[PDB]
Amino acid sequence: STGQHPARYPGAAAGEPTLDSWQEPPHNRWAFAHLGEMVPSAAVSRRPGHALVRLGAIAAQLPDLEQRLEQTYTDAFLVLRGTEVVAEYYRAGFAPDDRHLLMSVSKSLCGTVVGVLVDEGRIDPAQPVTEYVPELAGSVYDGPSVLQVLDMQISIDYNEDYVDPASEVQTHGRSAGWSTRRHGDPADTYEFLTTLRGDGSTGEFQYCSANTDVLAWIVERVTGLRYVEALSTYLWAKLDADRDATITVDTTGFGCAHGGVSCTARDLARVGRMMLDGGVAPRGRVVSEDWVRRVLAGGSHEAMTDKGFTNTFPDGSYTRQWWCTGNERANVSGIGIHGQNLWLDPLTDSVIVKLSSWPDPYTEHWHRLQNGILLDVSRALDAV
């Protein structure tokens, strides 16, 4: 058993509704107003083939930027300097206010929600995960602290080979509803997480999407809110965003905290703006100055042994669901596969959003090109 979870609606039975019950009372009063949570659905546009190119000032310093964006499969690109949008690009077929999947940039949003609850003293990072989710006893998450989840310093047997249906990465996806279920699969994400094992060692960075969903589970047990609602209440609703974000949900309504958020490029930039404003958003403080300082300061360098990162960023690290480059600009970024970045450049008080669709989830090639663009743009923002 995975214990108590936030009901899909007030008074709902555990796990209700499902795809097979949403039409039935009492579920249907909720489901009729939220059908996209149950059944795949398309937008029917209220608005009635060409790229939008407004690269502003940096265009002069980076004449080939549009081509570089095309080459890295850029869908949306936006530079916010202070409070001003100073550069924008959207590919043909993608509107400025279209939403785009964030993949693991989602993780940085989840960590921010955890941060709010740490500020409130509702989560103590020093405490074991099991202080908040007892049902993870007997799993790889029995023993490690919440901070070790935040910093992803837990050794976990999690096969990342996505061509093998038996792999943890594929099983995680099926448990989240991202792919067709197979016989024997865990019923939902909570159950999947309880199946995870490891040798018990901690302290070394291991990037693992299970960690972020554990954080979201903790958020739910501490607040009693569905992660979907927590993400809105503690973050999204404070941004004064143009549009709602969306997040995929599994069969219990659990949002895919680790990878399933979509939003507009301009709205994602508001998250970066909040980070560079010491944790304050237009509608109130999101996280404390201290939390933001700790993110910008970076994680343990000793822990960071991923050469896919350190080959480019020798002094890099990871903390609280953010990648910290440790470069001479101290850049910090949310990163997601196929080319998603929420890139922070505190030196110039700027945020760069790049949302893309590389054909491959990861290669050294793509990251070299992408990081080259983000660094060139950052430097183009320097006073001269």
Next chain:
Amino acid sequence: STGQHPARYPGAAAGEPTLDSWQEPPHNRWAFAHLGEMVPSAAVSRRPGHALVRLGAIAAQLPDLEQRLEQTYTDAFLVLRGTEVVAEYYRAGFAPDDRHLLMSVSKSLCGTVVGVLVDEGRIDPAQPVTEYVPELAGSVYDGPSVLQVLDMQISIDYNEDYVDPASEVQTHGRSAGWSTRRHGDPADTYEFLTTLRGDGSTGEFQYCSANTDVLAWIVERVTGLRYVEALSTYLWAKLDADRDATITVDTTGFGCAHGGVSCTARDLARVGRMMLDGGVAPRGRVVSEDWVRRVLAGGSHEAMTDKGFTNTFPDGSYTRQWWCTGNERANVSGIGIHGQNLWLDPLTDSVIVKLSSWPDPYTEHWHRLQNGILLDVSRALDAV
């Protein structure tokens, strides 16, 4: 084989992507911007428990109206007199700009799209369905005219017993993705439709959701547009709506024309406003004056043998996906299960939207109560 269908995106292979391929290139460029079409997803609200009650003038004439709305499980209620919203009600938990499933009110929207194409001479109602969808040869739709589909005057073996998994109604739902697939089920809605049979007789009204999906299929073959896009281009985008509508899609991306549209109450009222404006919307003409006249005039009374309708409306009928009461006000309505109405009251130049969630999809009791409310409100709008 069900023949050519509109690609999910430009250049897409038939039937691609699926739930198991959307992450792969080249699909992912589209899917990353439209993930809700593939995976169930929740809104993360950009906005930070009480009913909104603004029943305006009619409140004096109908003092118990709020209670009557509660008793009929009303989620949203809106009265548009001319261009003015003169009465509104939303239940606790449902915001004025929340969207609500329309069920078969969706059918009236589909018929409107067909009407546009009839105006353009791209569809001839007198022609057989097979003139536009040859692949329906050998089915119950081999022989009948497009008008007979529009007026639902085709005898079809379509079991409406939704407690029997083997019934056509349940099979239709699984084919549309509204319920979990069972072994042996048709691959998609197009295939399901080709399996339908009947004794060959026509002329008598038989309400059947398969008819509307056939109309949408015709729309797709005539225009080359996904029904989702056709519904936007020919109707929704001309309304100057506050929000996009949404529509559920099956595994091929085919929108559930017969029942799967959701929108706000205020925006649905814009469709009624267009009908009472002779087919003209704010951004241009949607359908011809003639088409609207034919809807308001009603269908063949002889054809209408559904006592569930005629017991209340003896002179009622059905045409072009609208129910025509034939009462002394000549009221015409879109109707959907669990209490959805797009109700037209030409006498007072008014539209009434009622979106509800009765525990039951249909009973005589619910329809008596609902029709009593719609008629009382209509009469309250009469000059005195």
